[model samples]
Target chain A: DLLERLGLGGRRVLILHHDDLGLTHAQNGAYQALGLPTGSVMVPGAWASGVKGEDLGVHLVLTSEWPAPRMRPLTEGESLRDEAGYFPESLEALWRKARAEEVERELKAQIQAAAKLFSPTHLDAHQGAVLRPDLAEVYLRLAEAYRLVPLVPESLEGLGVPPPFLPELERLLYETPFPQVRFLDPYGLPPEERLGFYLDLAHLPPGLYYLVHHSALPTPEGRALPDWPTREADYFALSHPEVRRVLAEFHPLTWRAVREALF
Target chain B: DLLERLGLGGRRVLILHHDDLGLTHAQNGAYQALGLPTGSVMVPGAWASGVKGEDLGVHLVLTSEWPAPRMRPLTEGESLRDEAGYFPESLEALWRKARAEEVERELKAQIQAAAKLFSPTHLDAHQGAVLRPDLAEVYLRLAEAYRLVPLVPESLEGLGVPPPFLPELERLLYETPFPQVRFLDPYGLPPEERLGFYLDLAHLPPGLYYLVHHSALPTPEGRALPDWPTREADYFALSHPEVRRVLAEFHPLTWRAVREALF
Candidate 1:
């Protein structure tokens, strides 16, 4: 009924796209080990092994999260990278240094590389960096050019925009041509609360929703790292029988299906 | 001489006024134990057992810090206190909730109470809460009315005011009748760095400088606190012969001297 109200009847769509696929070989290997059908890969990360596929979306990376396994731009002369030649470790740092021209060229270079290697399904921003309004314009423009769906949120509330900018932002989001889904990122919840939190998503209105996960099973190398516990927890939660049951109730669809429905 | 610039060539002013004197009886006992000739006490804090003196400045409390040993307000109907009836734990909370009229009434009440108990030498805000522009007016007004010198900072940089308000603030501070001293609070340094940090104060081009400390002599109870290490370190640092040598080099004076100069 909720989907019908949005004129998207019979499509209670859900996408369980794994994030940061190309961040490291460990992440990529975990995706391979899980045998998942779809994911988003950091473009520069994919450069090492040259990943390409219809099920994959280009995870346009503007900042690198992990210090140990960092990302760099494919094109030279990017202001986004820090003095150490890695993308700055924070969104705030990226915002401070990122130039509009440099951002566009780097994003375009990543997408073109991904397109060369694989038939991509959609485009999404890593760490939700494109949610920043200045970069959001660049994201939407490129999404339109590539005929790929952009993952802009349906509502900008609770995303750290200042109060005065909200009105103009709301109007901008409304006018964007690409289909967007109300997004839920569950990684922030305590590990014990996460599965229950995902189960509680059954109450969501049925138009379209994206539930992002960073899935990687525990390995010997994974256990040695500081972030292993969180990544391991996410791995367990994603593959858990209970999670499968909860996800089954929604009849989860892929980004490929959503793309066909839109265009 | 440093004091010549401020037209008080004979003065080599240094007020080592201990903060939060009335925060706890432990704090009060420590102040007494340290044998400090001059200190500042929260007026509401002074209520339990009654603290008073000419060497003491009325520490005009607009906010309370520390959850374990928090202080409350004297008067009823204060917006300053939280639902649990303690003043909120930080300066920002005080700024948000403090009404101009309420700030004036509460401050006036504290000063009157202290005036009745002792011949207080000066007025200073606890945790520098009165430096907030909204409450600064009330602080200056009461300081003038009571013939008490207000302890506003001589310079406004690095105090987190927006750029546009700087000119007006700088002009207002220049025009104000109450004599202010350049202030130093060295609590941000590590224990190893603290003594050396204070000794670096020998380089100050000082007319009048108030070096504030939250001093507490090491005790079993003090060491058991979350902030114990800092307080214990401060207690030792203040009495250390090295600090005394630094003060001697600078020709240490007191709030008593400042009061005489003002009156």
Candidate 2:
């Protein structure tokens, strides 16, 4: 009906989706843990590579939002860790280090390493650190060189990152920006509840709506600040019936889907 | 005239453009050595751990293009490596080795190690090798787990490449209905020629375009090849006055720009 009204008739949705299959061993288990009936739509990581349904994502990365908010280095030969080998304590600190040039190496290393490891379907910013102006230039450049699709969140105001930076990015390469519904504030939401929000959010964008949430299963000895389980709960949500319902309803769009749709 | 017509008088073309920043070492140096007027745009590596733009790109694995088309192992894991320790000679070999659970461990190790090294802006597939169905799943998972953006090339297709896979790529991802331009093809134009097409095409539709291309220099070796000078010419052209003039004509859009323009 929508297609007919638009005078197209017979156009549907194409989605590129990734619940969580690369954060930790736990995440891997969570994603593949689902022993579904293996329908044609079961685009699991074990399937194929590239942009296929089963294809995994590299998630060209930034920091480690684990027990302590750790910022990965942008390239090799540099690290943000103290003698103990942990990331800086705050986002601001990470930014400072990045601007200083000491942090980009490690960050780039992590991304390069991940590409080799996962051979992902696509890549997305973990915490949107690359969205920062100081780091944006480098991030966008690498993406073009590598041929990876960047996951961008959409806000009512605009592209959710920054405005002035847009033209610069456009001049360099292509990007994949998807509408992202803020399910729960990443700061305080429970992982599971956040997952619930994803369920509802899924209803909004039929094809593929990027679902982002950290993943951590609450450790006892240390690492309690960032709400680990809430992150983990996000992983759990994909298995929830409601979330599955959304998946069932939509065709799930990947970067490739967007490519075909727009190109 | 555009601004005056729109009732916004003081319109300025503030495109702080940078070119060839996506290349490694030589390209990076060229941009860094741009000296004085210092190109406004810069790209930080996701695995930038060592030096911001210095020895940065730490921990991240580096891939060799062409003459040395081999997938290097992330760390020490070599069972999955080719004779050269890179991908198994070709994409198919890598896929075969990876499919049997033979190389996944190596892939994971390298990424995990890099995460510890640098917090990247986002991970991007070094080559389209990961863009294949056989490797995308892992890439997708990595993005989800790390909270990074995959380098999804939405526009800039037809820029240049031996095999332009944008069209088939879109279909492979799943095209339930259909998109305006399934795959952007500039018809294997070298970088310079592609830029001309890129600017001309920029005015079309205003949706996502696969902005994929290689930025290189015209070295004796590079210029000798059928594709070399073309890519090198592209790098030089991007920063050239004429190219800037064309880019200045319209608002250079990003992958996100196109996505937002439609859907």
Candidate 3:
């Protein structure tokens, strides 16, 4: 039903997106090597500058999630960082401390940085930090200013939206010309079972979807990380011959295509 | 034989110690909640400044290992950081970039931070970054200067020591008054099997071992992490009644006692 609004109703479609493109060399290398239709880059990540592509989107980030492999605000956003000047490690910390003005500037800086590196198609959230009720306004505003499609989810009902922000979030979701997507990130599943999870999608309804993954090529440095199994296995799954054959049934689409259709 | 050096012969002794004390609120809270005898603190972590105690030792850190929950050097260690001034993610990155001079200063700063907050009894490496032969000298030197016991491993053979640094690592390992412990961090085991893993230690040989665990009580913040299972399960296992009863047979020892015995 969502795909019909984008004139993609007739065929089942999948946007095989690899998120966290520049989070690490392993991630960048994997995305670079793979032929996925679309993926997004975290401009604040360490390897952001080195990786680039036309199919990329700005992965707007506000939290680093872990103490290592951290993301810093592209601008001097005082409210975004801890006392040590690194970005806060949790979404709760960011939501609590971040000034709206700082959030706008920081998100703008990320988009600006990413634009210089690649022709990013859409703007998406990293760790969904940008999608929170308070921060989502700044995020959507930046997407409009930049003329990039804002990746709004199908509904905010399940995403724990506070009652106060529900009307505004709903307005943003419904009003945007961009197709509302059901985001599919099977990161909770074991790495070995990820491809199998994808296998469960042989036949599907015609709907807008973002089958997001963190597919990374194995690296000597990657082994030290906890998510290597997921990253590496995702890479293997997306690159597997059977996977390519199976997913060929679904029409591959991109944010660029969506932008062209609507804008 | 190594335990006999500490007058702990004819009995299996277990430190049952937790590591990464201040890595997060979850880790610190877990350690504080448990009666695990002894634990160490990571002075550079976000929660580091909040947690404190007497049995705590400085978990001397050089690398942050990940990006979000990153660790920054307490001192101005230019060699220890990337352009963002956060510590490197990988051990090799730290080894490649860090100068011995900067390593000493940064490590000294961590010890200083912990010392001000805690009456630390021993000094140990975080992520084994200090155990590297190039930096081992600085680590051992700092331990003696501070009058704290250094955690020296039994052998550097399996730890991929470069041929040039063999004699130096050996000198630091064998010559120090500190016992050469066989470190046993079962991080490789899946979290579900972790407690069962400890069950395998029912009748372990009388060897000097450091069954270092990253025990952490569950927090709303902790659940978002990849290693939450290991941390929570470790906490559950260490606090478990069966764990206490079984480990009671193996005499519980502390770094403080080890210091008193050897110093």
Candidate 4:
């Protein structure tokens, strides 16, 4: 593995990405101050209302799980809206009704909206909705047309990995010619153990490891949701001395850095 | 057990008390709206900063465990201060350093502070600190002098209950003239099981049952602390339909009602 030839040799590259940046000003503010490598904010949401940064990526949203008071859609229709005018409350709901055209239209609007405020370095989907088989093609097409790196999982072949149960977008990653990066699964561990998982960087196979995170100050809007503590836990974990020590052992890269290195 | 001898026979009495109301405004607001029998707010703290309600009690304090940025002591001295000049961060710290005179003085200040805003119906301690033998005497003495009911464990001797390893204060309840009430321990149960514990009213042996709970809204201040979710869980459990159903089967009495019955 001539590291520079494959863009693989630089310090065991790890993309420390912060997702849901534009969820609130508190979130956006935390993202800016935390000094992480990548920022991904939601579109058509107040959190992304005035986002301004080069380090950001568009978190293309198709489902709005928040309350009626918190969020709605950039575009609307039966494909986008549930009984209420807002997006459906869950990924399952969006998977059932989302039309490719509607997802494409809304996601493009989101990317453009974010682009107007800040030049997003990449594109990723919110709530993993676009990963659904019904929606992944539309997501890839938009990422391609927009000339943005879609933040999808890299091909898992030849890494001594067995085929595990993967969802739509993940399966697509296995089949597509997109840039291959290993997506780290940070869930399923107790929060206290999460820092250790990140610290065990030596175990991460030699390649680009995409580590996604949600970090926020305990803002009122953030606290109103059930998952606020987990978000806060991640925020603390990223800044944790142990995680910082592990990252020091690796070459940390943002999506923009990967883009320049690959292209 | 006569019908009116202690004036406790007319109803299967339950004291539904909310603890840590002064922990945050989120807690205080939830305490006010929950429509429970009593609200126990902290003293020398913001939670009771301007609260004016008769349906409240004094959560006597000897320690403040919140982050230095979040909270400090109402009064400060060698007996109360940790290295930071705030109340030592935990109940153990308070027990180690708290002098009898300082404990009395600080708790009196709390009771008086709360009394000025709201005629507190009773007195209780935060994190069960006042249950210590050295502090329990001060607690009981203050209740006696101020004519406020000190929340204490009920005599457990009469219900065919073997003596568990009782704390000094709990053992004191068995031999003293303090009013007898059954103490309900609901701390270890999962949030979902809490409603069931309350529903099992038939399992309760006779006499008043003192049920202490920590309830708070999911505010930024509340969520900042590690125990906030558990407090929120308790907040939800207090108003849950099943707990309400069980309350209807018996009688819900506030500390003021107990004061009348006991004194």
Top DockQ model: 3
DockQ for candidate 4:
0.02
Tens digit of lDDT per residue, candidate 1, span B33-92?
A: 667677776766522223555588788887756533344454544586664445678877
- In Å, candidate 2's interface RMSD is 17.0
Tens digits of lDDT, candidate 2, B84-114: 3344545555444554233345445545554
Write candidate 3's Cα lDDT for B91-161 as tens digits: 87888778999899778867876776668899988777875677888888898899788877776656656
Q: lDDT by residue for model 2 over A135-188, one digit each (tens)?
A: 666665555566655454444234354566566555433443322322223435
Clashes of each: 0, 152, 15, 7
CA shift at A131, candidate 3, in angstroms?
Answer: 32
TM-score of the B chain in each candidate versus the native B chain: 0.87, 0.57, 0.92, 0.85
Q: What are the lDDT scores of the predictions, listed in order?
A: 0.68, 0.40, 0.74, 0.66
Candidate 2 off by > 4 Å: A1-21, A35-53, A68-79, A100-108, A156-188, A191-199, A202-208, A213-226, A256-263, B1-263
lDDT (tens digit, per residue) of candidate 4 on A34-130: 8765878776543354455657788887776654123445544458866434567887787778888877777776777667656777888776676
* Docking class for candidate 1: incorrect
TM-score of each: 0.47, 0.38, 0.52, 0.48
**RMSD of each candidate relative to the true structure:** 19.8, 26.7, 11.2, 19.3
State chain A's TM-score for model 1: 0.88
Residue-wise lDDT of candidate 1 within A40-100, one digit each (tens)?
Answer: 8776552223344447888888886663344556554548767545577887788777888
Q: Which 10 successive residues of model 3 chain B have the least lDDT summed?
A: B66-75
For model 3 the TM-score comes to 0.52
Pairs of colliding residues, candidate 1: none
Q: Is the docking of candidate 3 incorrect, acceptable, medium or high quality?
A: incorrect
lDDT at B245 for candidate 4? 77
